[PDB]
Amino acid sequence: GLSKEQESIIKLAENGHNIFYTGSAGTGKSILLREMIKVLKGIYGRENVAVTASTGLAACNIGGITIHSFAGIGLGKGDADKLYKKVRRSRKHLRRWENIGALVVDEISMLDAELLDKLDFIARKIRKNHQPFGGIQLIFCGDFFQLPPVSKPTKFAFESKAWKEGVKMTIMLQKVFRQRGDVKFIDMLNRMRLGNIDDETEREFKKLSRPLPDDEIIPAELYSTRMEVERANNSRLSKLPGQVHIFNAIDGGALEDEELKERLLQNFLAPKELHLKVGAQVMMVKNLDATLVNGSLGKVIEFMDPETYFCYEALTNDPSMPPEKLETWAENPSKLKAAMEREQSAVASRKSSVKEGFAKSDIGEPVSPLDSSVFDFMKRVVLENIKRKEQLMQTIHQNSAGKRRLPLVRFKASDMSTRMVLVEPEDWAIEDENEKPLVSRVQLPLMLAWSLSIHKSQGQTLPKVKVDLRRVFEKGQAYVALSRAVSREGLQVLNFDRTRIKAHQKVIDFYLTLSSAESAYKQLEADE
Amino acid sequence: LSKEQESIIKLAENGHNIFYTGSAGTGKSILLREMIKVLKGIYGRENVAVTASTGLAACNIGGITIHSFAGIGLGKGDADKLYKKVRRSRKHLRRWENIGALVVDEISMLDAELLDKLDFIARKIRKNHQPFGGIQLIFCGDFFQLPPVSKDPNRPTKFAFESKAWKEGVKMTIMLQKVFRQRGDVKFIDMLNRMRLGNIDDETEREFKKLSRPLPDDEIIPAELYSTRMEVERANNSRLSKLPGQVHIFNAIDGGALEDEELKERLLQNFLAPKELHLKVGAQVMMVKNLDATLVNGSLGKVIEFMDPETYFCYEALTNDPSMPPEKLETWAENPSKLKAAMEREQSAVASRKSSVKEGFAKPVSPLDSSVFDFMKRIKRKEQLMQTIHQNSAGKRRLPLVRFKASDMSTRMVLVEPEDWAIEDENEKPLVSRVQLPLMLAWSLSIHKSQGQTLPKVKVDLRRVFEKGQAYVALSRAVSREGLQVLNFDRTRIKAHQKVIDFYLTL
DNA sequence: GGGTTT
DNA sequence: GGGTTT
Numbered sequence A: 001g002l003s004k005e006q007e008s009i010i011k012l013a014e015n016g017h018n019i020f021y022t023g024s025a026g027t028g029k030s031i032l033l034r035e036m037i038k039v040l041k042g043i044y045g046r047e048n049v050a051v052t053a054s055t056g057l058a059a060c061n062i063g064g065i066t067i068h069s070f071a072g073i074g075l076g077k078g079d080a081d082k083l084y085k086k087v088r089r090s091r092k093h094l095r096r097w098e099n100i101g102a103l104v105v106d107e108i109s110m111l112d113a114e115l116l117d118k119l120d121f122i123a124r125k126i127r128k129n130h131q132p133f134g135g136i137q138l139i140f141c142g143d144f145f146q147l148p149p150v151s152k153p154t155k156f157a158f159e160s161k162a163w164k165e166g167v168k169m170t171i172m173l174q175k176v177f178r179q180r181g182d183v184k185f186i187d188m189l190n191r192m193r194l195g196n197i198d199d200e201t202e203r204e205f206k207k208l209s210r211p212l213p214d215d216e217i218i219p220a221e222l223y224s225t226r227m228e229v230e231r232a233n234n235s236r237l238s239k240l241p242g243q244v245h246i247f248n249a250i251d252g253g254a255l256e257d258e259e260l261k262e263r264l265l266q267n268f269l270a271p272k273e274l275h276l277k278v279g280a281q282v283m284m285v286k287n288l289d290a291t292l293v294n295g296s297l298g299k300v301i302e303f304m305d306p307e308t309y310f311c312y313e314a315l316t317n318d319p320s321m322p323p324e325k326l327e328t329w330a331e332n333p334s335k336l337k338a339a340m341e342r343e344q345s346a347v348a349s350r351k352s353s354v355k356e357g358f359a360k361s362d363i364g365e366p367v368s369p370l371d372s373s374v375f376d377f378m379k380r381v382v383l384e385n386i387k388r389k390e391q392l393m394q395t396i397h398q399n400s401a402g403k404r405r406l407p408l409v410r411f412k413a414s415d416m417s418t419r420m421v422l423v424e425p426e427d428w429a430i431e432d433e434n435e436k437p438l439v440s441r442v443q444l445p446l447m448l449a450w451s452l453s454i455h456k457s458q459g460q461t462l463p464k465v466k467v468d469l470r471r472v473f474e475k476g477q478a479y480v481a482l483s484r485a486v487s488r489e490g491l492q493v494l495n496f497d498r499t500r501i502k503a504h505q506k507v508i509d510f511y512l513t514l515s516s517a518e519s520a521y522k523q524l525e526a527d528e
Numbered sequence B: 001l002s003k004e005q006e007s008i009i010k011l012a013e014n015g016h017n018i019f020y021t022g023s024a025g026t027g028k029s030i031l032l033r034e035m036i037k038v039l040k041g042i043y044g045r046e047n048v049a050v051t052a053s054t055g056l057a058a059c060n061i062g063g064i065t066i067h068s069f070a071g072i073g074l075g076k077g078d079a080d081k082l083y084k085k086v087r088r089s090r091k092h093l094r095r096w097e098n099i100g101a102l103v104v105d106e107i108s109m110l111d112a113e114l115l116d117k118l119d120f121i122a123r124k125i126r127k128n129h130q131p132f133g134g135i136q137l138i139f140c141g142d143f144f145q146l147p148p149v150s151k152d153p154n155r156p157t158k159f160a161f162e163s164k165a166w167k168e169g170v171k172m173t174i175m176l177q178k179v180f181r182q183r184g185d186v187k188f189i190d191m192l193n194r195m196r197l198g199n200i201d202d203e204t205e206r207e208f209k210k211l212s213r214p215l216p217d218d219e220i221i222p223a224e225l226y227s228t229r230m231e232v233e234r235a236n237n238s239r240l241s242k243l244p245g246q247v248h249i250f251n252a253i254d255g256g257a258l259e260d261e262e263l264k265e266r267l268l269q270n271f272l273a274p275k276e277l278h279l280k281v282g283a284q285v286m287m288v289k290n291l292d293a294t295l296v297n298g299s300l301g302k303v304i305e306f307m308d309p310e311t312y313f314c315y316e317a318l319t320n321d322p323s324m325p326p327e328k329l330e331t332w333a334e335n336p337s338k339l340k341a342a343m344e345r346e347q348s349a350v351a352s353r354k355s356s357v358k359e360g361f362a363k364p365v366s367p368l369d370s371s372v373f374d375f376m377k378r379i380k381r382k383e384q385l386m387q388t389i390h391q392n393s394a395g396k397r398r399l400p401l402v403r404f405k406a407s408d409m410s411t412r413m414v415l416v417e418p419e420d421w422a423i424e425d426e427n428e429k430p431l432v433s434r435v436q437l438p439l440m441l442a443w444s445l446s447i448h449k450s451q452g453q454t455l456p457k458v459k460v461d462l463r464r465v466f467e468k469g470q471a472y473v474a475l476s477r478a479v480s481r482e483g484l485q486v487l488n489f490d491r492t493r494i495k496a497h498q499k500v501i502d503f504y505l506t507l
Numbered sequence C, D: 001g002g003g004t005t006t
């Protein structure tokens, strides 16, 4: 049930227009975009639509990747000319820029003008085409009353020449869906969007400091800073039943400033001390393949070594398999190894030696048995309780005594598909001019993700959420946090301060220039 | 003056290892200045280490940063790494051997792990298993003021009093009570004192909020306090526009052994020294590098004029003998070679390497400001001769000439030259680097650097307060409410650390 | 303070 | 967010 307004935005995109569309939090911008992408792929070809957002989690929300990863620009810091040369040195990224017909960019408010101009420069040069983005069709989506770009001065995306020359058409949504049960809640949010909080709104938000329902549902929690988020995630993890599994990163290398090293290690995004349990909610923080990327969300199923996981995966791919195969692998692990390995640079092999000494195996420490929940896939004819496989699997797991046990994670994509991944340690490095590492880390590419920074929460729908505004420092940050909620009953707000909720005048000015959904219908009848 | 202040001095004189404390403005640093004199007469002038946690707080008592005194650099490595670094330096090794007393002011911004490392270094160097190798300790400060700064995501800071070194070394604690700085306003003192403990009632909040009114439009340039360097720099550059002079621009010169420009740009972000430094006659500045015994990080001064070294040598000669024979200035004016010969009569490879980078630090004529010719105005052919000598400097760097003032009120006239900063690998290879003047504008201060100052006229903007004790430090700099303006006061952002509350209950 | 990376 | 160095 897309609205008339939402569908008209899809049809304008179908007709080939360069559009920016927008609307308050939870007006269905990303939900419509999911549908739009399906039809753009049929117009341009499945691989010829770049699906992108300003953050990894917001990109995963629509089945896409970071604009940075897609473009091939890294952090995109330098001169446009250097970035273009960096991109064309990557055959994957050069072909992508030559081949795509459409570029979808969600949560665009966090992309600064300098980035937009450089992306435009890169597309024009690669495609040998002086049209606004080398002629790529533009679908820009977001709300500039939400978070602005991180400025580490930055200008908004709509201030760039690339924007003003590329964006042909704008459409504004008005109906709020996320909080549709509660019209008074919507008005509180919409005035907060514009920075205009009155006494009754302040009273109503301050009422929400009461704790959330005590149900067994683990709440989402939103904070301004990573230190708050990490503290809240590790707090929740300690409350989870179960033995903790600790993954201590291996850090190097040669940079002398100890503090600078730690600051740089932070932006590898995986923590120095990763603590995990069965059932922990985790986020992938490295771009590993097409569908396992920075922002992919998952749940820890158990901890297994690769040998145990091979048998488990074989069992989950054929539950009615005769247990004879599993018994051979139990009593003859050399055949498990051969069976497993039948299916599977130089400084690369020197990173594998470092990864070999990661999460070191304790030959003395007893291997806890597999949580019984992992055999539920079988346990949905009296002979057909030949689930002797379960004890066979438990034996094979005990034979992992003195081997490293990695988290098995079920990742869930935005289209609801799932993927089982035994998550291996990864490596991050910053190197000098002779390729010696200045700063390096080996760690699982995971972090706890019940709690989110408000930045990474932007784009999420959170039906049970606690928000602590104590450390908000950006315009729109408080609004993003509170507008994640679905119902007032599923929202707790701590440290609400109306003086720290103020909108950017440039955005107020810009939004008076935008066209309505009714003008969108007029364009469509003009189109056809 | 007070009996309480004198008795702290008497205890130190008697040899005790002392921590002493009290609310902001109780005279801890004023009494420290007299105590330092007494200790120097006991141990020897060079044998009392006078230090503090920040450069500006150190200058307030005629000292230097504890890091600079210790020889440990940034002081983040483990104890054995730092010990080797210190003893590898002969000046710092002799200091650690020779001093009989170590004075540390504003001790609340020093982490416990640093005190443990200094303890280790002192015991090893002096071959002595007593606390800090038998050095007498005088620690001073207020832990309800700012805590130690750490950018470590993984390890939280520990207050100095949590360290084994403190618990074993600090034998004696004294608490001062009478607040002197806000003497004539007893209600302001109560407002500040409960604010120190995180207690602010409705009436006190309304009182602070009333101080949003502007400060009087007298001739006096107010000091201005902000939480962040960005705010500080914006305020300093605003006030720089308020001065009538012509602007003088100093652009930094960057380099390093790195070739990947996106990493070099990622790393240059960290540097204190600006890409661009703007100065005028009369600008208030602060030295940010330790250059010699009395020109250090924290030295405050005022820009007099901008001169090349040839001109300054002439100006310096004139200020050192205003009843000069004018024939010398005419000779120098009409024969700059003789100027240089006289200049150089008074006077490596990697050092000549940067010294050639430094020669490229400037490049079109501009007459001097009439202020620099004060002479003895308490017949004057010397003035326009100096102007002539100046105009010949077309085509060379005209550096800021700065009048620095120490806390003892002694002044010092310095022509300030560029300096270097580098980020290095473990073999001291420079990865990225910057050449720039060791100066920043200093009308506005961060609240961190203000800790320890007394500011009779101050504007405070608390908008970006993020740290326990920060609002309290800012507002307690003021002498009177009449001299204080407060913007963006937030009572929720002022609560004390429970470990500090607990620590002081025991004293 | 906060995203972004073969 | 802030501070500390040749």
Ligand SMILES: Nc1ncnc2c1ncn2[C@@H]1O[C@H](COP(=O)(O)OP(=O)(O)O)[C@@H](O)[C@H]1O
Residues within 6 Å of the ligand: A001, A002, A003, A006, A023, A024, A025, A026, A027, A028, A029, A030, A031, A032, A177, A178, A459, A460, A461
């Ligand atoms: N047309 C619609 N009908 C019913 N529910 C909708 C509709 N559009 C959006 N929603 C729901 O509202 C919520 C917010 O949608 P989303 O696309 O994330 O908002 P936005 O991207 O505008 O912030 C989602 O839970 C979505 O399922």
Ligand SMILES: Nc1ncnc2c1ncn2[C@@H]1O[C@H](COP(=O)(O)OP(=O)(O)O)[C@@H](O)[C@H]1O
Residues within 6 Å of the ligand: B001, B002, B005, B022, B023, B024, B025, B026, B027, B028, B029, B030, B031, B180, B181, B452, B453, B454
């Ligand atoms: N005994 C005293 N008599 C008069 N004024 C004093 C006395 N002690 C301190 N002061 C004044 O109070 C102000 C704060 O002193 P200071 O030592 O800077 O305080 P603290 O170090 O405790 O913050 C200074 O201006 C100082 O001149």
Ligand code: ALF
Residues within 6 Å of the ligand: A023, A024, A025, A026, A027, A029, A030, A142, A143, A458, A459, A460, A461, A483
């Ligand atoms: F605008 Al949204 F989730 F994308 F609130």
Ligand code: ALF
Residues within 6 Å of the ligand: B022, B023, B024, B025, B026, B028, B029, B141, B142, B451, B452, B453, B454, B476
């Ligand atoms: F405690 Al102070 F200036 F040293 F307020």
Ligand SMILES: [Mg+2]
Residues within 6 Å of the ligand: A029, A030, A031, A106, A459
């Ligand atoms: Mg969205």
Ligand SMILES: [Mg+2]
Residues within 6 Å of the ligand: B028, B029, B030, B452
């Ligand atoms: Mg003091």
